[PDB]
C-alpha cells in the first residue's frame, strides 16, 4: 500500500473482518505509518460503524499515520494507538476515542468540524489539540520538559495538564468569539474545554485557566471587545474551582460587575 486508496481498502477489508468476524491477529491489526489523507471514511464503510451505538473499531495501531484533510466524523475508536500521527485539518465531528493513545499528535483539526471531538479514558500527552473539544474522561499525566509542536501562525502555547493549547496571536473579535463565546457557538469554547475535564483534575483546570487569563491580561483589552463574551466568561469562571483562584478572581471582578448591570 503506497497510497491512501490502498490503505483505505486495506482497512476497509480489515475493518470488515472486524464485523465481526472475531477475532483478528495482531500483525494484521497494525497500521503503523499508514496514510489516510483526503479519505472520507463513511463512503468506504458501514453506517453501523458511523452512528449511534453501532460498530466499534477495536485494537488497532495507527501509529505514525497521516490523517490529513480526511473525514473521520461520528466514528468510535477503542483500544487504538494514534501515537505520533498527524490529524491536522481532519474532520472529526463527534468522533469518539475510547481507551486510546493519542500522545505526541497534531489535533488542530479544521474548523469545518461541527461537533466537539470526545475523548474518554484517552491520553493526549504532548498532543496539540484545538481549543474546542470534549475532554471529559481524559487521563492526565505529569508534564515533561517537552516543547510545543512547531506550527505556523497562531500565538503562544499554554499547558492543559500535559496537553498543548495554542493561544491566538492577538485577541481580536473572532479570536475572542471562537475562544470564549460558547453561547453563540453552542457550548464550544476554550473555557468549556478546560472545564470539560473531570473534577479529579481540579488543579490542572485552574492553572490552565490561570494561564489562559495570564494571556488575556497581556493583550490590551477593551470592554467593547469583551462585551459579547461577558456572559460566557461568567458562566464558567464565576463558579468553583475558579472562584478559589485569586488571579482569575481579581481579573473576573470588574467584568462580572458590568455584566450584572443588566
Amino acid at each position: 500500500p503506497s497510497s491512501p486508496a490502498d490503505w483505505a481498502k486495506k482497512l476497509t477489508d480489515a475493518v470488515l473482518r472486524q464485523k465481526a468476524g472475531e477475532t483478528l491477529t495482531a500483525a494484521d491489526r497494525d497500521f503503523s505509518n499508514a496514510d489516510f489523507r483526503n479519505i472520507t471514511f463513511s463512503k468506504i464503510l458501514p453506517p453501523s460503524f458511523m452512528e449511534r451505538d453501532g460498530d466499534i473499531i477495536k485494537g488497532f495501531n495507527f501509529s505514525n499515520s497521516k490523517f490529513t484533510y480526511s473525514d473521520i466524523s461520528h466514528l468510535h475508536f477503542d483500544e487504538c494507538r494514534f501515537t505520533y500521527s498527524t490529524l491536522s485539518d481532519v474532520v472529526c465531528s463527534n468522533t469518539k476515542f475510547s481507551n486510546s493513545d493519542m500522545n505526541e499528535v497534531f489535533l488542530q483539526y479544521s474548523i469545518t468540524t461541527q461537533q466537539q471531538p470526545s475523548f474518554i479514558d484517552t491520553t493526549l500527552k504532548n498532543t496539540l489539540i484545538r481549543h474546542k473539544a470534549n475532554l471529559s474522561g481524559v487521563i492526565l499525566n505529569e508534564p515533561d520538559n517537552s516543547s510545543p509542536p512547531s506550527v505556523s501562525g497562531g500565538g503562544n502555547f499554554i499547558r492543559l495538564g500535559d496537553i498543548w493549547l495554542q493561544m491566538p496571536l492577538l485577541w481580536t473579535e473572532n479570536a475572542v468569539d471562537g475562544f470564549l463565546n460558547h453561547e453563540h457557538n453552542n457550548g464550544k469554547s476554550i473555557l468549556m474545554t478546560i472545564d470539560s475535564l473531570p473534577d479529579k483534575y481540579s488543579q490542572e483546570k485552574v492553572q490552565a485557566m490561570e494561564d489562559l487569563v495570564k494571556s488575556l491580561r497581556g493583550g490590551r483589552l477593551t470592554e467593547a471587545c469583551i462585551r459579547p463574551v461577558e456572559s460566557s466568561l461568567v458562566s464558567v469562571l464565576a463558579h468553583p474551582p475558579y472562584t478559589q483562584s485569586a488571579l482569575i478572581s481579581e481579573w473576573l471582578g470588574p467584568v462580572q460587575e458590568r455584566f450584572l448591570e443588566a
Binding site: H131, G153, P168, L169, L170, T172, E173, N174, G178
Partner: protein, 61 residues
C-alpha cells in the same frame, strides 16, 4: 483547511496580502502598528492607507 492565523477561527471578511496569506480584516487592522504589517507565517509586508483594502479572497460558501 484555512482560518486567520491570528484569531485561529474561520475567516470573516478575508483579506489576502501580496506575499499571500489570507486573514480576517480586523485581524489585519488591529495587528497593524506603525502602519506596517507582517505575515505571521513568514515575514514583513506593506501597509495600505486605510485598512479594509487589499483583495478579498474567494468567499465560501
Amino acid at each position: 483547511f484555512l482560518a486567520c492565523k491570528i484569531c485561529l477561527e474561520q475567516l470573516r471578511a478575508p483579506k489576502t496580502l501580496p506575499c499571500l496569506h489570507t486573514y480576517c480584516q480586523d485581524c489585519l487592522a488591529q495587528l497593524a502598528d506603525g502602519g506596517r504589517v507582517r505575515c505571521p507565517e513568514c515575514r514583513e509586508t506593506v501597509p495600505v492607507p486605510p485598512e479594509g483594502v487589499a483583495s478579498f479572497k474567494t468567499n465560501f460558501f
